[PDB]
Structure 1
Amino acid sequence: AQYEDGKQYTTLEKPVAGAPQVLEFFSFFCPHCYQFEEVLHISDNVKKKLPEGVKMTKYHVNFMGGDLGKDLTQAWAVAMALGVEDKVTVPLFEGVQKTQTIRSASDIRDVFINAGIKGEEYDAAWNSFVVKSLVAQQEKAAADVQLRGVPAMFVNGKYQLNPQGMDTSNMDVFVQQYADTVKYLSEK
């Protein structure tokens, strides 16, 4: 076939019921994730090819960057609760991987302040049980697929994108192959 299990995707031996339709995992410490976000714009190109009625989920993971990795998972929870993902994603990636100006929870907080979220608003969220359960959800979703690597994308709790099995001669061609695969899996 044109799309084959073990080629553009793999199938989970242990499918995850009730899972989000399109589920993406990343880490601000993750170099291909940086690429996926700033150079390739994967999430965005997948969205543009997804059907009517499909919601898109993105979660941060703990297993990179130790103590800062978890702060970042809590910060992403803050970003999701406040709905400010699109304002902090780039400065967090660049603060971690490009300028290396993020070394503590306080530096993460600085990114949000600079992006215009109020201190009082940030600290209240950071400490809220709504963010606490949002962190729990991120962990649980990763746990359910026994996730050991990022970037990762899972569709309908059953299929896992396999970008290693796509051409990288051309970045545009790669992205479309990736998105077209998500769409195919979506319709599956």
Structure 2
Amino acid sequence: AQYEDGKQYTTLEKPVAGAPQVLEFFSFFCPHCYQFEEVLHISDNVKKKLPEGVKMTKYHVNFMGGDLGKDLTQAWAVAMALGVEDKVTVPLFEGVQKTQTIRSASDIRDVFINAGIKGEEYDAAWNSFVVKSLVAQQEKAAADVQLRGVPAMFVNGKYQLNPQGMDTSNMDVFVQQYADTVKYLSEK
């Protein structure tokens, strides 16, 4: 076939029931994740080709960046809880990897506030039940798929995208093939 198990994607030994249709794992403290998002724009490309009714979810991992990595995972939970993911993704990536302006939890807070989120609102969300739950969900999902590295993407909690098996003869062909594979897999 055009797409085959072993090439563009691998199948998980134990399928995760009730997992998000398309789950992506990343970290702001991850160089390849920066390229994946900010440079190559793999996510946006994948989203653009997803079938009707298929949604994409992005979880942050906590095993990178030490304590700040932990704080960034909770801050990401806040972003999801408040629905402001697309307002903070860029400043967080740039601030962490490019300009090196984000070095603590309070620096992260400044980023959200500058983005339009009121301080009280952020602080409320930070200590909320929804956020505590989200933090736990993110780590649990990573464990369910036996995640050891990011960036990574899973479809229907059964397939894992395998970039190493894709056509990497050109930056554009790679990106397009990645998006096409996710689309193909979600129709299963």
TM range (shorter): over 0.9
Cα deviation for residue 160 of structure 1 reads 0.3
Separation (CA, whole Å) in 1 of partners of 2:18 and 2:116 = 35
Moved more, 169-178 or 28-37: 169-178
Alignment TM-score, normalising by the size of structure 1: 0.96
Separation (CA, whole Å) in 2 of partners of 1:17 and 1:161 = 18
SS in 1 for 2:49: coil
SS in 2 for 1:64: coil
Separation (CA, whole Å) in 2 of partners of 1:186 and 1:112 = 33
2:75 aligns with 75
Moved more, 126-135 or 168-177: 168-177
Cα deviation for residue 168 of structure 1 reads 3.2
Please give the per-residue CA displacement for 1:10-40, whole angstroms capped at 9, x wherever unaligned. 1101111111110110000111110111111
Moved more, 67-76 or 39-48: 39-48
Cα deviation for residue 151 of structure 1 reads 0.4
Please give the per-residue CA displacement for 1:119-159, whole angstroms capped at 9, x wherever unaligned. 11111111111110011111111110111100010000110
Say how many residue pairs are matched.
Answer: 188
Please give the per-residue CA displacement for 1:142-184, whole angstroms capped at 9, x wherever unaligned. 1101111000100001100011222334222111100000011
Separation (CA, whole Å) in 2 of partners of 1:34 and 1:167 = 21
Moved more, 38-47 or 88-97: 38-47
Gaps of 5+ in 1: none
Moved more, 78-87 or 1-10: 1-10
Moved more, 29-38 or 69-78: 29-38
Cα deviation for residue 3 of structure 1 reads 1.2
2:123 aligns with 123
Alignment TM-score, normalising by the size of structure 2: 0.96
SS in 2 for 1:48: helix
Moved more, 39-48 or 173-182: 39-48
Please give the per-residue CA displacement for 1:67-99, whole angstroms capped at 9, x wherever unaligned. 111100000000001111001001101111111
Cα deviation for residue 4 of structure 1 reads 1.7
Separation (CA, whole Å) in 1 of partners of 2:84 and 2:157 = 26
2:135 aligns with 135
2:57 is the alignment partner of 1:57: yes
Separation (CA, whole Å) in 1 of partners of 2:75 and 2:66 = 14
Separation (CA, whole Å) in 2 of partners of 1:174 and 1:105 = 36
Cα deviation for residue 44 of structure 1 reads 1.2
Cα deviation for residue 114 of structure 1 reads 1.3
Separation (CA, whole Å) in 2 of partners of 1:144 and 1:165 = 23
Root-mean-square deviation (CA), in Å?
1.0
SS in 1 for 2:28: coil
SS in 2 for 1:62: coil
